[PDB]
Enzyme design. Structure first.
Site, PDB file in Angstrom:
ATOM      1  N   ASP A 300       0.836  -1.192   0.000  1.00 44.74           N
ATOM      2  CA  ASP A 300       0.000   0.000   0.000  1.00 44.74           C
ATOM      3  C   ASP A 300       0.873   1.243   0.000  1.00 44.74           C
ATOM      4  O   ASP A 300       0.592   2.215  -0.698  1.00 44.74           O
ATOM      5  CB  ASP A 300      -0.917   0.006   1.222  1.00 44.74           C
ATOM      6  CG  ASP A 300      -1.856  -1.183   1.250  1.00 44.74           C
ATOM      7  OD1 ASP A 300      -2.200  -1.682   0.156  1.00 44.74           O
ATOM      8  OD2 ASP A 300      -2.245  -1.617   2.359  1.00 44.74           O
TER       9      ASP A 300
HETATM   10  N1  LIG Z   1     -10.717  -7.333   1.481  1.00 46.55           N
HETATM   11  C1  LIG Z   1      -9.925  -6.113   1.795  1.00 46.55           C
HETATM   12  N2  LIG Z   1     -10.290  -4.924   1.326  1.00 46.55           N
HETATM   13  C2  LIG Z   1      -9.598  -3.838   1.594  1.00 46.55           C
HETATM   14  N3  LIG Z   1      -8.418  -3.902   2.409  1.00 46.55           N
HETATM   15  C3  LIG Z   1      -8.018  -5.060   2.900  1.00 46.55           C
HETATM   16  C4  LIG Z   1      -8.730  -6.212   2.629  1.00 46.55           C
HETATM   17  C5  LIG Z   1      -8.073  -7.255   3.273  1.00 46.55           C
HETATM   18  C6  LIG Z   1      -6.971  -6.695   3.923  1.00 46.55           C
HETATM   19  N4  LIG Z   1      -6.961  -5.384   3.675  1.00 46.55           N
HETATM   20  C7  LIG Z   1      -6.014  -4.383   4.162  1.00 46.55           C
HETATM   21  O1  LIG Z   1      -4.771  -4.605   3.565  1.00 46.55           O
HETATM   22  C8  LIG Z   1      -3.780  -3.943   4.365  1.00 46.55           C
HETATM   23  C9  LIG Z   1      -2.425  -4.530   4.071  1.00 46.55           C
HETATM   24  O2  LIG Z   1      -1.985  -4.171   2.762  1.00 46.55           O
HETATM   25  C10 LIG Z   1      -4.267  -4.073   5.808  1.00 46.55           C
HETATM   26  O3  LIG Z   1      -4.144  -2.814   6.472  1.00 46.55           O
HETATM   27  C11 LIG Z   1      -5.762  -4.445   5.674  1.00 46.55           C
HETATM   28  O4  LIG Z   1      -6.643  -3.599   6.384  1.00 46.55           O
END
Ligand SMILES: Nc1ncnc2c1ccn2[C@@H]1O[C@H](CO)[C@@H](O)[C@H]1O
Ligand SMILES: Nc1ncnc2c1ccn2[C@@H]1O[C@H](CO)[C@@H](O)[C@H]1O
Ligand SMILES: [Cl-]
Length: 345
Positions: A300
């Protein structure tokens, strides 16, 4: 100098619950290394089970949110970034909303009807395995209606850059599709993340459709392999996937440059674009074992780092270094924690 609302994202605003998990947890919930799963019924006990454990770290999460708010944090100019997501009418949702305001991130959260609670991610941390179990909760209720509201849609129209993670396919595909079509129609910069292996396996159509509107596509090795297998790229899968994704036609069939970046952990990342016949390696920062605190959210941050520099006219290589720096900053920290901007170096 960028105008206010230059960068727009929509996504799943979630609470990360980071726990030092016991080994049995991974076998019990059948969790794979570095993997992400959307919770099913068999997973649901995990949330009450980890609440029994001490040393829990509650911190704002959500892939798209992490990226866009770090772009905001990097640029330092107030209100340059805007974000749209669906939270619940609970304290977790308000915490997340206040986290954004503190960063000068302009938001227009949709609030889900009670008692649907803000989504959460159980982040299970151990020496051998890292794994995430996602309860999307309120995030699923993000609707095209909310987005099409005049005061919300105006954020999209003034935006020149978009970032939406693949994760949003499970919550509001119609919204991200509409914005992607708008972006390509007005020749804006649409940035897309492959986000997770399961999206390319089970939502291949949506992934490929989004790619056809994306000027920049971010991925990692794991996603590139899952994507490649699904598309019958059996030989040289990761490289083949970068080439394939880069070369995929745009939705309007016009000739355009699509940049593709595939990160590979500690190993050199790959990049190329539609007009480039070659795939390049780019070496990244080296870390000793004890320097690595928590790599969660590194992807991210990487995206945020690249975009924040790229949209201000910095060349490719310069932008790639800024991406690694953003990623390395998060790696030396627990959760997606953004500290004081001065200490970013
Ligand atoms: N299905 C989803 N949709 C959006 N974000 C997602 C997920 C599953 C995990 N995460 C987020 O990814 C972050 C790690 O890169 C972590 O910070 C976590 O919150
Ligand atoms: N174990 C490691 N050592 C050094 N860097 C790491 C890792 C793991 C991840 N990364 C950085 O995160 C970016 C996106 O995953 C990658 O581009 C990369 O910069
Ligand atoms: Cl997201």
């Amino acid at each position: 100098d960028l105008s206010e609302g230059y960068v727009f994202g929509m996504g799943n605003p979630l609470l990360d619950i980071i726990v030092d998990a016991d080994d049995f947890m991974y076998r019990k919930y059948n969790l794979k290394k570095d993997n992400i799963v959307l919770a099913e019924e068999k997973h649901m006990t995990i949330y009450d089970e980890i609440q029994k454990k001490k040393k829990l770290n509650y911190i704002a999460g959500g892939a798209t949110l992490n990226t866009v708010k770090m772009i905001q944090w990097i640029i330092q100019k107030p209100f340059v970034c805007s974000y749209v997501g669906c939270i619940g009418a609970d304290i977790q949702g308000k915490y997340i909303k206040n986290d954004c305001s503190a960063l000068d991130l302009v938001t227009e959260f949709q609030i889900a009807e009670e008692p649907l609670m803000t989504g959460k991610v159980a982040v299970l941390v151990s020496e051998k395995l890292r794994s995430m179990v996602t309860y999307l909760g309120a995030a699923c209720d993000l609707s095209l209606a909310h987005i099409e509201q005049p005061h919300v849609w105006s954020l999209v129209e003034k935006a020149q850059v978009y970032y939406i993670a693949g994760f949003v396919i499970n919550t509001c595909y119609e919204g991200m599709l509409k914005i992607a079509k708008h972006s390509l129609e007005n020749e804006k910069l649409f940035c897309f993340n492959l986000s997770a292996p399961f999206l390319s396996q089970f939502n291949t159509k949506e992934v490929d459709e989004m790619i056809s509107y994306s000027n920049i596509v971010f991925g990692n090795e794991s996603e590139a392999e899952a994507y490649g297998e699904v598309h019958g790229l059996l030989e040289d899968t990761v490289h083949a996937t970068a080439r394939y994704i880069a070369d995929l036609p745009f939705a309007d069939g016009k000739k355009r440059k699509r940049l593709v970046i595939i990160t590979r952990g500690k190993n050199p990342l790959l990049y190329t674009d539609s007009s480039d016949s070659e795939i390049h390696q780019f070496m990244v920062e080296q870390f000793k074992d004890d320097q690595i605190i928590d790599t969660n959210g590194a992807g991210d941050a990487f995206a945020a780092g690249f975009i924040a520099d790229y949209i201000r006219g910095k060349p490719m290589i310069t932008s790639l270094h800024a991406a690694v720096k953003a990623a390395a900053y998060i790696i030396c920290r627990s959760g997606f924690s953004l500290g004081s901007r001065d200490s970013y170096s």
